[PDB]
Each structure stands twice: as C-alpha cells, then as structure tokens.
Amino acid sequence: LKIDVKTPAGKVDGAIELPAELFDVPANIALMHQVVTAQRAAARQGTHSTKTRGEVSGGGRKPYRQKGTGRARQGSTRAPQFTGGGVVHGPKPRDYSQRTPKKMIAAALRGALSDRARNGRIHAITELVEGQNPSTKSARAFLASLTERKQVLVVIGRSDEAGAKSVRNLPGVHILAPDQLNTYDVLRADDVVFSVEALNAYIAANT
Amino acid sequence: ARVKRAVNAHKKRRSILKASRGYRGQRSRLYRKAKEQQLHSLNYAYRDRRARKGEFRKLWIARINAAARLNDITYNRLIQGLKAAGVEVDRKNLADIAISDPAAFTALVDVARAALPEDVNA
Amino acid sequence: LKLHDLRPARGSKIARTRVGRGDGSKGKTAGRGTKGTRARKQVPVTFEGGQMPIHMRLPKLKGFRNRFRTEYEIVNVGDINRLFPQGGAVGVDDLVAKGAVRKNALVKVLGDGKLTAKVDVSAHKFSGSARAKITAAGGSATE
Amino acid sequence: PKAKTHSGASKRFRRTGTGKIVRQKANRRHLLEHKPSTRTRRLDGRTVVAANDTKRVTSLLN
RNA sequence: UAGACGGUGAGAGCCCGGUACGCGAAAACCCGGCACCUGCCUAGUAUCAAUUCCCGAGUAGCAGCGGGCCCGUGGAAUCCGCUGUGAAUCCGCCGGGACCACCCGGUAAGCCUAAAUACUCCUCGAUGACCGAUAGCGGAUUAGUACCGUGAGGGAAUGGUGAAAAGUACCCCGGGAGGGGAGUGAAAGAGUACCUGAAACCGUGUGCCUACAAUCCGUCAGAGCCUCCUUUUCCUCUCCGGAGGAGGGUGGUGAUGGCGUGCCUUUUGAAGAAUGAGCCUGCGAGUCAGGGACAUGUCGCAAGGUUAACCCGUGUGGGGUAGCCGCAGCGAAAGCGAGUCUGAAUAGGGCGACCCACACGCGCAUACGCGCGUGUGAAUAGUGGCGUGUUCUGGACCCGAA
RNA sequence: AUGCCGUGGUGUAAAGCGUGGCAGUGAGACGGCGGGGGAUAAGCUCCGUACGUCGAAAGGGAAACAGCCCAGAUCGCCGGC
RNA sequence: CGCGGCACAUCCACCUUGUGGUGGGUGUGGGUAGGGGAGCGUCCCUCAUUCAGCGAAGCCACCGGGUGACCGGUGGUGGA
Ligand SMILES: [Mg+2]
Ligand SMILES: [Mg+2]
Ligand SMILES: [Mg+2]
Ligand SMILES: [Mg+2]
Ligand SMILES: [Mg+2]
Ligand SMILES: [Mg+2]
Ligand SMILES: [Mg+2]
Ligand SMILES: [Mg+2]
Ligand SMILES: [Mg+2]
Ligand SMILES: [Mg+2]
Ligand SMILES: [Mg+2]
Ligand SMILES: [Mg+2]
Ligand SMILES: [Mg+2]
Ligand SMILES: [Mg+2]
Ligand SMILES: [Mg+2]
Ligand SMILES: [Mg+2]
Ligand SMILES: [Mg+2]
Ligand SMILES: [Mg+2]
Ligand SMILES: [Mg+2]
Ligand SMILES: [Mg+2]
Ligand SMILES: [Mg+2]
Ligand SMILES: [Mg+2]
Ligand SMILES: [Mg+2]
Ligand SMILES: [Mg+2]
Ligand SMILES: [Mg+2]
Ligand SMILES: [Mg+2]
Ligand SMILES: [Mg+2]
Ligand SMILES: [Mg+2]
Ligand SMILES: [Mg+2]
Ligand SMILES: [Mg+2]
Ligand SMILES: [Mg+2]
Ligand SMILES: [Mg+2]
Ligand SMILES: [Mg+2]
Ligand SMILES: [Mg+2]
Ligand SMILES: [Mg+2]
Ligand SMILES: [Mg+2]
Ligand SMILES: [Mg+2]
Ligand SMILES: [Mg+2]
Ligand SMILES: [Mg+2]
Ligand SMILES: [Mg+2]
Ligand SMILES: [Mg+2]
Ligand SMILES: [Mg+2]
Ligand SMILES: [Mg+2]
Ligand SMILES: [Mg+2]
Ligand SMILES: [Mg+2]
Ligand SMILES: [Mg+2]
Ligand SMILES: [Mg+2]
Ligand SMILES: [Mg+2]
Ligand SMILES: [Mg+2]
Ligand SMILES: [Mg+2]
Ligand SMILES: [Mg+2]
Ligand SMILES: [Mg+2]
Ligand SMILES: [Mg+2]
Ligand SMILES: [Mg+2]
Ligand SMILES: [Mg+2]
Ligand SMILES: [Mg+2]
Ligand SMILES: [Mg+2]
Ligand SMILES: [Mg+2]
Ligand SMILES: [Mg+2]
Ligand SMILES: [Mg+2]
Ligand SMILES: [Mg+2]
Ligand SMILES: [Mg+2]
Ligand SMILES: [Mg+2]
Ligand SMILES: [Mg+2]
Ligand SMILES: [Mg+2]
Ligand SMILES: [Mg+2]
Ligand SMILES: [Mg+2]
Ligand SMILES: [Mg+2]
C-alpha cells in the first residue's frame, strides 16, 4: 500500500500511497481469462484465404457428356474432389475481435495490478537515466538493482524519450504508457516498474 | 492451419497389418481386406471363447463315459450315484482321474454304485 | 499472476460437435436419417404440405393503428414515495436522474401504491387516482 | 443480414402482457344468415393460440 | 538510441550485409515563399414616392399513355418521358400525400463549386495462430508455354547431391551401357538415374507345411518339426563351454477335429445371382458472416444493462448517450390506467395486475384468518459479453442433369 | 365371456402429467386369434387385436432356414444346474 | 448359480457430508434411426518448463502397456 520511490544511482527520496480501490481488488481468474483471450483474439490479422470452385481458374464447361462413357458424372474440372480444384469450407479472411464490456476490462486490469501489488512486485522510480541522453548500460544496471527476474513491465510517461530509448532493446523488458495498461502485459510481467509521474497519472485517471 | 493426414492415419493401419500376419493372400497384405478379416476374426474369437466351455465339457463327458462303461456302469447312473453319494468333484477332474489313476476311478465308481438306489425304475 | 494460471470457469466452454466423423459419433447421415427433402435441404417454416397454412386461414386482426398516437412514460406514486422519502419538489428531470423514467419523453403519473411523503410533482397528464393521492398526502400536482 | 418477420403472421397474431399469443377466429366473415347467434357469439372474440401451434407461430413472429 | 531480419561448414548483438541513429543531390520533377507579371476597384449611401416596367416559355399547369417512388392504379400526392392543349411576373407562381378555404414555407423553367466517399493495372515499406511443390496464382520448372480446336476458346506436367564439385585420376571386364578395385568426402547406407526414402508391386536365400482332397480362407482345440533362452543328470574336459539327455519357456509353422453365408449402400427381407469397389499412396463433404432469431451453460454489472458511427492512442487501451432492451396494461382507436374492453348494467366474461410459513391494532371464528403500516425479515430481474444446439439470408454438408 | 369408465385398498424405483431444447419415423413383414374382398385360392389383398417376433436380437432347437419354439449377449473362467 | 474385473443409477454412513470424492447394499448394463455425456490422435499460436550434431523429425523392427480411440521403452536408419 505504501511504496517508496527509488532514484537511479542512489536511494529513496519519497513515497507513494496506492489507493486500495485500485490495488487491493480480489483476483477474478475467469474474468481475467476472458479479457486476456479477447485481447489475444483482437491481436490476430486473420489474413488467410482460399479459393472456392467458383474462383478457381477455368473449369466452366462440363468436361464430357453425362451418359454413355462408363465414367463418373463430373460437371466441372474444378469440383472439390479434383486435384487442383476448389476448397470446401476453406479459410476466408476473418476479423477476430470481441466486444468485452468496459467494466469487465477495467475490473480485470485492476485485479491483475492488485495481485502484483499484493505480492510486492510494484516498484516506483523517479526516472531511469539521470542524464538527458539514453544509456542502456546504466539503465540495465538500475533495473538489475531493482529486480532479478526476467519479464519486467516498465510504465513511463509518453514524454520520456530519454528513458524509453535506454531500456528499449533490453530483452525481457516491455514499455507502455500509463494510459495503455492492459491485463495481458501486466500478467506477463514479473515486476511492474512505474515512474513516479506515470503512477500518479494512472491513479488520477481513476480517482 | 492446414493438416497433412499421414502421420495420424498410419497408426491404425500399422496395427491392423501387424495383427493380420499369417493370413494368406490379400488378407495379410492389403489394409482394406485385413480390416474385414479382423472383424471376422475377433467375432470368431469372441464366439469361441464361450463355445469352448461347452466343448471341453463335451470331451470330459465322453471320456468319463468311456471309463465308466469300462468299469461296467453308464455315465448316466454314475452321475446320478455320485450326486446321491454327495461327491462334489467336477467333470474336468473326473476325466483327469480316469486318464491318470484308474484305481481311484474304480473306487469312485464303487462309491457311486453303492449310493445308487436299489431299483432305478421306481 | 502468470498467464499460465488462467483457466475458464467450469461449464463456460464446451467443445463443438463434429458431425460427419465416423460411426462412434454422429456417423454418416449426421443426424438426418431420411431420404426425402430433409436429407438435403431445409423445409420453410411457412410450408404445411399444401393445406392452407395457419398464417393464411385465420382472419386478420381487426382495426387500424393510429399514426398520430402520443405515448407517455409512466411513473407510479408508490415509486415516487419510494424514491423521494424526504418529499420536496419532484420534476421530470429529477425522475430521469433517479432513473424512474426514460429521458426525453412525456411523463404521466399513475396512482398505484401508497404515497405518504409531501411532494410537489410537476408532469404531464396526471391520473385520476394520482391527483387524489397526492392531494391527500398534502402536496400539489401541476402540469 | 437482418432477420425479417413474417408479414401475414404479424398481421394475424399478437402478444399480450404476459407473452401469450392471441388470434381471432374463423367462419365469421360472411354467410351469416344461417348461423345462429350462439354460433356467432362463440366465434366472436380472441383466443390463445393452441399449444401444438405455439412453436411455429412464435418462429413466424420472431 | 543497435538483442529487426538474413547469410556464413550446426541456435551469432560483438564474423558478414545490415539494424538504432545520423549524414547525402549535378540535374530533372513536385510543393511552398518572395518578386516580376496579370487582373479588379474612377461614390453612390441613406430617406421618400408606391404610378409604371422586370424577375429565365412552347415552360409551368391540365388531360392521355407509361416509368419510378414503402406505394403492384389505388382516394395517389411529390419526381421523370412521349403526345395534345397551353399561362401568368409578385394582388404572381409552386409545395405542405386526392381536393377546397385559411395559415406556413419557398421563389422553377441559366451555369460553376473544394472536403468528408469509392477503387488499385502499378511503385515503394512492412505484416500474417496464411500455403509449402497433388498445397499456394493456371503458372517456384519453356506458362498462358507444350498440347488440343477451323475458330471463338480450352489448357497441362516437370523443385531438393554435397559445407565445398572436392562430380570418382589410374587399373580391370565389357563395342558400348554398366560394373569391380582404387580415390574424394564426416557420410557414396550422398555418384549429376543423386536429402529422407513408406506402401502397393517384383525378386533371391532360407525354417516349417503341402501331390486322396471339396477350403468367405478365419477362429477355438491340437500333435509334430525348427529356432533361441532356461531348471535337472552328464561330456566334469568345469575357470571350462555346454555335446546330448529330461522339464519348462519365447518365436515360426500347422498334420488333424469342431464352428463358421465377404464389406458398403439400400431394403419387409441381401452371402446374395441387387448397388459400389483391381491394389497402394496422396487429396476429397455441417463451414463462415451478422450488437440477426429462439433456447441453454458461464462471467460482469444490476432497477438498470449496454454502446454504434466516430475521436484520441505503436496495440489489444481510453473516451463517445445517438440509440436498443428492461421499467404497466387494456382497447380498432379517441382514450383511460392497476385497471381496461364489451356492455343499459355496480351483470358476466376477455386480457392484465395483486406473497402470508407469521406477530402487532382492527370488524373479525372454537379455530381457520378477511384489509390496512412495519418487521417475524416475505422473493422477485433485467441486460451486455463469451461458448453450445437449432434456425434465418446467403452456394450453406459434398458431388450430378436434360 | 372379454374389453371399457369411475372409485376404495394393496403392491411396484427408473410409471404418469405440464412446460421447453433436439429429433427420427410417416414403404412394414410374418405368425396366433376375429372379419371384409377373392373361388370362403395365393409366400394374395384390406382392417381389428396393453397379441408376439423380426425390423433394431446375438445364443440353443427346427438338416439348412428374418418373422415358429426356448431364451434377451457388461467382460473373464479348461466350474455347476 | 459360483468366483473375479468394469460401468450407470439409486439407497444407507463419512470427507467441502451431491463442486465432487470415501465405504457398503440393491437394481441395471443387446441395439438401427436418433438424443444426451465423457475422451483419443494430428497441426498452428501464447505462457511456463524441459531435451537435441554426445543426434531432433520421419521411417523400420522388437519388447511391453491401457476399458477404447491409442501410448511407452530399446535398437536400427537418418540428419535439425
Ligand atoms: Mg466458373
Ligand atoms: Mg453446370
Ligand atoms: Mg495446377
Ligand atoms: Mg489450388
Ligand atoms: Mg471501447
Ligand atoms: Mg498360418
Ligand atoms: Mg454354459
Ligand atoms: Mg460408412
Ligand atoms: Mg438430428
Ligand atoms: Mg425425414
Ligand atoms: Mg423411405
Ligand atoms: Mg444415403
Ligand atoms: Mg424464406
Ligand atoms: Mg389444394
Ligand atoms: Mg364484416
Ligand atoms: Mg346474426
Ligand atoms: Mg538472427
Ligand atoms: Mg562466418
Ligand atoms: Mg408505377
Ligand atoms: Mg402514382
Ligand atoms: Mg405541356
Ligand atoms: Mg395536407
Ligand atoms: Mg425564377
Ligand atoms: Mg453541376
Ligand atoms: Mg468531391
Ligand atoms: Mg501447382
Ligand atoms: Mg515432398
Ligand atoms: Mg492450331
Ligand atoms: Mg576417405
Ligand atoms: Mg548420413
Ligand atoms: Mg544422404
Ligand atoms: Mg529414383
Ligand atoms: Mg535416396
Ligand atoms: Mg497326403
Ligand atoms: Mg460337404
Ligand atoms: Mg479348420
Ligand atoms: Mg457346417
Ligand atoms: Mg424388394
Ligand atoms: Mg454383389
Ligand atoms: Mg457372388
Ligand atoms: Mg435380389
Ligand atoms: Mg442389376
Ligand atoms: Mg436399384
Ligand atoms: Mg464393379
Ligand atoms: Mg466459430
Ligand atoms: Mg447470457
Ligand atoms: Mg396496445
Ligand atoms: Mg374484469
Ligand atoms: Mg446474468
Ligand atoms: Mg420433448
Ligand atoms: Mg406418405
Ligand atoms: Mg403408409
Ligand atoms: Mg385370419
Ligand atoms: Mg378372408
Ligand atoms: Mg403379404
Ligand atoms: Mg404388398
Ligand atoms: Mg395380424
Ligand atoms: Mg429399415
Ligand atoms: Mg435369433
Ligand atoms: Mg424388443
Ligand atoms: Mg436361432
Ligand atoms: Mg442384458
Ligand atoms: Mg447399450
Ligand atoms: Mg445411433
Ligand atoms: Mg557428427
Ligand atoms: Mg512438425
Ligand atoms: Mg527412438
Ligand atoms: Mg529415430
């Protein structure tokens, strides 16, 4: 509930209080599962396609006469039983995406963040690199000071181009703005590191 | 996701062709013919696992009849007399005794004859 | 935590039935059975085999429909009493704010329930019983 | 594609406040001279649709 | 600020092309600016008068016959065509769903007009819970080619040595083809018929059975052979190893005995002399769309539930109240409304509302309770998403005519 | 005589009824008993039958032999009646 | 009928005393059209984890295993 803010190359400076109505919600497993499934479904392209017997090239006329040959009745050379013919119930371009209610989405995100906070995986920092120029070496040293786990979600403001670039290509580190937080990314991360102003903005956007 | 069928499809084919070894002609070489032969074979084995229980009783009764008539008594009256005497040995072991220990079988026949009623038509 | 820990609620998702996949399931006719129409096509709901159907041998319902009819959203004095225990003024905006009535519609007050609170209801087209109940309670009913 | 309702069915049936489906009755349009008042009064009014027809009339209305 | 992607003798941020990032244009073309240049503006403003003129003509209107509108000629307005007839210029004319009166709105028969919308032969840059050589375009291969047709047209099949060609010098048999030995290679169990290399099908060798027997070709019983392991009494040569003998067990074969009328489809009934199938391999049939409809399982919120288009965001995130469903019914409707309709009816019916397992006061019965206010604490409910079954409109489970 | 309607007792798990979801079927065959048509012929034809079997029922008997007699296969046993 | 294994339904007693398990009785378990319930195998994606040039996939043989679709172990061939 009470998180202490850490500084790069140094120690604590302040503290932040997490409101319990945003970080102490119970964990609805089924709700989060549905929300995450909807997210991943909307992430698809669905650009698969096939050709039906009406779209395969040629094959318009009846290949030979109906009777008197001793062969099966055929009707077209692009019928699905033919090699090179059409596809029956083949894939067509689709749009996988679901209309999950906003209340369910927000509740799932709140539950995930509450689980993280309850296990103690929420960290708060002032900023990543004390300079104005990016430096992956020092940013990685600072993150390793905070954390010894693989997947880390770094939430920083959209105006911190000096600090986003620093941790941009660190493996296992994911960056997103406070207004783009989502259940999938929170649940994939092991620790969530907030910048102080990013955390305050997220808290203010929910009161 | 397009799926090629071969890897899954051959699993049943191998088992059919492996169980169909020893059949002559297409019935051991071709999967479609071996499948029909396997249907017939497993039905036959089911039928025979229940028929042999009567088959062996038939054989035992034949041998018991031979041994009893050798000892001058019908299988008919030997069975009646053994039940009257209260001997509860079954036909498998009666036939086994008749093959192995004829003296013991003669003793059993004496017991059955003794327990049999004096006039068997009353 | 840990995406490999999310599972759906029991009974929420059940596998679809695949209908042309061998004898141990819906085998070859796929539940159709027949040799007739229903083995290849659907029969329209309106078809009855050739006798006059139910939707054609019955007379049309009598009357017309008024193109010019006015509709009122209704609220009862019992609901008013439940929603405004302290009494006071009761307007159409107050009613829509409390959710007792749809918005942007003409409101008519009906007289079902018990009214005890002194209220000042402004609406359209009061009922006969509603006026009596409101004035017995001690308020007023303006239009 | 949006589902279309049946025009004639919607003209000949309607629902009540509890979801019952009601209809009028036949034989009451003409040739009324030889029909006694008992028969005409019986044919008057509205009746609930029969239980063996309710499924199809519901499908027609929806 | 580079861990994108690919290559290199096997999974490479540090080996290579690159990537983040940052520079770079003689000239041509495009866009923008500034000039040149080109054009327009050389008093009419306001007030009064209310006499006169003007305000788009073969037009409007009307009639006949048609077209198109929710509108299938109908009481048929509005809009468009051909034929006939044929005005008026504001005290005019047209519209407001036959038509008339009043009121309201507008000013036909002249022209031009960006943006928000549709599309991709084509050019660049990305991406894919898309395909991977019978798939994906007809076309990874000479592909609209070969070939077929007079012609319009129709229209294929054919990818993989190896890291590197190091692609087998030399010898031998052979006319050659082909092979054997050498040699290269990690591998020739990779030899230009070349990665892996299944099945049908065809050989060669070998164990058992088979030339006196009537067989849906198997199954149960079953002797005898052969093979390989093991407990015994023996070659005790035994550290041996096992020759053999006796037993047991694997595996192969099956003399002989019983039982036994293929599979599918379709039928009252098929081994059927009814249908389909030569065999193997590959391919080949209930799918998808939609805030569709009905019903159910499950999750969120709950007298409320939910957004659509759209806007902002690298995304799956945040906004967006228009709308929809629930919220009171009855009636042809005016209407009325816990009732309403019919009806002369305070008659009866139709449809619709309305808890008692209980106490308190109350008219109340021996009791049972009849109605009213609360609890003794009396039971409601909808809506959005996601599954599943059925259904609708679409080719709609697949194939097939004349 | 049977059958049918009602009612009071007794018995009986997988009866019955209402309301929804999803069906298939709507070509029947033979045998027993009662009838029509037929010549009181048909492995004929059309009805009845809280009649049976087959259909959709394997096993035993009937030489073989859907519909007749016995009997309804959860699997195993070299047990018995 | 005897002895053993399995399953469905139900009754009787416990463990969450019907989310479901535990113990014992009893009844039931032929099946076409068709209805309902629970599973096997193939491929692709995500998350976690674990094998692989000291040899993956595929294929072949043998030895085993499960109530079924089917599974495992060892060896050979092979080369991601
Ligand atoms: Mg075509
Ligand atoms: Mg055609
Ligand atoms: Mg082709
Ligand atoms: Mg194709
Ligand atoms: Mg949204
Ligand atoms: Mg053999
Ligand atoms: Mg027996
Ligand atoms: Mg079949
Ligand atoms: Mg069905
Ligand atoms: Mg049918
Ligand atoms: Mg039929
Ligand atoms: Mg068919
Ligand atoms: Mg239709
Ligand atoms: Mg007719
Ligand atoms: Mg009339
Ligand atoms: Mg009359
Ligand atoms: Mg790479
Ligand atoms: Mg290299
Ligand atoms: Mg018209
Ligand atoms: Mg008209
Ligand atoms: Mg004219
Ligand atoms: Mg008008
Ligand atoms: Mg004009
Ligand atoms: Mg124009
Ligand atoms: Mg435009
Ligand atoms: Mg091709
Ligand atoms: Mg290939
Ligand atoms: Mg030519
Ligand atoms: Mg070498
Ligand atoms: Mg190799
Ligand atoms: Mg090789
Ligand atoms: Mg070859
Ligand atoms: Mg090869
Ligand atoms: Mg011989
Ligand atoms: Mg014979
Ligand atoms: Mg034999
Ligand atoms: Mg025989
Ligand atoms: Mg026939
Ligand atoms: Mg045949
Ligand atoms: Mg034949
Ligand atoms: Mg025939
Ligand atoms: Mg024929
Ligand atoms: Mg035929
Ligand atoms: Mg044939
Ligand atoms: Mg789907
Ligand atoms: Mg729902
Ligand atoms: Mg109404
Ligand atoms: Mg009434
Ligand atoms: Mg709900
Ligand atoms: Mg039913
Ligand atoms: Mg019929
Ligand atoms: Mg019939
Ligand atoms: Mg008779
Ligand atoms: Mg007769
Ligand atoms: Mg007959
Ligand atoms: Mg007949
Ligand atoms: Mg009969
Ligand atoms: Mg049938
Ligand atoms: Mg039988
Ligand atoms: Mg039966
Ligand atoms: Mg029989
Ligand atoms: Mg049984
Ligand atoms: Mg069964
Ligand atoms: Mg079935
Ligand atoms: Mg190696
Ligand atoms: Mg694979
Ligand atoms: Mg292996
Ligand atoms: Mg291998």
Pick the closest to residue C77 from C9, C128, C30, C11 (CA basis).
C128
> Which residues have a Cβ under 8 Å from the Cβ of A160 and sit 6 or more positions away?
A127, A128, A195
- What are the structural domain ranges in chain B? 1-122
**Alpha helices, DSSP H only, in chain A?**
20-23, 29-42, 102-119, 136-146, 161-167, 183-188, 196-204
> Within 13 Å of residue C29, how many CA atoms lie on the same side as its CB?
8
- In this complex, the answer to whether residue B48 has its CB under 7 A from any atom of chain F, a nucleic strand, is no
Rounded Cα distance, A5 and A14, in Å: 5
- In this complex, the answer to whether residue C35 has its CB under 7 A from any atom of chain F, a nucleic strand, is yes
CA distances from A69 to A64, A73, A80 (A): 9, 10, 22
* CB burial of residue A28 (10 Å; 0-12, 13-18, 19+): middle
Torsion, Cα C128 C132 C138 C139, to 10 degrees, reads 0
Instruction: Count contacts between A and C (CB, < 8 Å).
Output: 24
Chain C residues near residue D12 by CB distance under 8 angstroms: 55, 58-61
Experimental approach was cryo-EM
Question: In the beta sheet, which residues pair with residue C121?
Answer: C90, C141
Instruction: Give me B28's structure tokens.
Output: 């051991």
Count other Cβ atoms within 10 Å, centred on residue C82.
15
Overall residue count recorded for chain D in this entry: 62
Using the mean position of ligand 56's atoms as its centre, give its distance from the Cα of residue C35 in Å.
21
**Alpha helices, DSSP H only, in D1-62?**
7-12, 37-43, 54-61
- Rounded CA–C1' distance between C34 and F26, in angstroms: 11
- Could you say which of A29, A116, A119 has the minimum Cβ distance to residue C6? A29
Nearest-neighbour CA in chain A from C4: distance (Å): 9
Q: Which strands, in side-by-side order, build the sheet including D47-48?
A: D14-15, D21-23, D47-48
Rounded Cα distance, C94 and A155, in Å: 43
Using the mean position of ligand 27's atoms as its centre, give its distance from the Cα of residue A87 in Å.
21
Answer for the pair A8, A129: CB distance below 8 angstroms, yes or no: yes
Rounded Cα distance, C32 and C40, in Å: 9
Looking at the complex, does the CB of residue C42 fall below 8 Å from at least one CB of chain A?
A: no
Answer for the pair A42, A96: CB distance below 8 angstroms, yes or no: yes
Rounded Cα distance, C23 and C20, in Å: 9
Tokens 């499809």 sit at which residue? B9
Rounded Cα distance, D36 and A171, in Å: 94
H helix count then E strand count, chain C: 4, 5
Chain A residues near residue C6 by CB distance under 8 angstroms: 29, 32-33, 36, 187
CA distances from C3 to A189, C8, D55 (A): 9, 12, 46
Instruction: Give me A47's structure tokens.
Output: 């650009």
Nearest-neighbour CA in chain A from C14: distance (Å): 15
Determine the residue type at A188. R
Quick check: A29 and C1 CB within 8 A? no
| Residue D25: strand, helix, or coil | coil
Looking at the complex, does the CB of residue C9 fall below 8 Å from at least one CB of chain A?
A: yes
CA distances from B88 to A153, B12, B77, B93, C29 (A): 84, 49, 15, 10, 57
Instruction: Give me A82's structure tokens.
Output: 């033919």
| Residue B11: strand, helix, or coil | helix
Chain E, protein-covered positions (CB within 7 A): 1-4, 20, 127-132, 134-139, 144, 154-157, 199-201, 216-221, 252-254, 258-259, 262-263, 265-267, 279-294, 297-301, 303-308, 313-320, 323, 325-339, 350-353, 372-373, 384-393, 395, 397-402
Chain D residues near residue C62 by CB distance under 8 angstroms: 24
- In this complex, the answer to whether residue C76 has its CB under 7 A from any atom of chain E, a nucleic strand, is yes
Sign of the four-CA dihedral D47, D51, D56, D58: positive
Tokens 């229903």 sit at which residue? C38
Rounded Cα distance, D29 and C62, in Å: 12
* CB burial of residue C14 (10 Å; 0-12, 13-18, 19+): exposed
Tokens 């229980």 sit at which residue? B53
Chain G, protein-covered positions (CB within 7 A): 19, 33-39, 41-44, 46-48, 58-62, 69-71
- In this complex, the answer to whether residue A185 has its CB under 7 A from any atom of chain E, a nucleic strand, is yes
- In this complex, the answer to whether residue B47 has its CB under 7 A from any atom of chain F, a nucleic strand, is yes
Resolution, expressed in angstroms to one decimal: 2.7
Chain D residues near residue C54 by CB distance under 8 angstroms: 53, 56-57
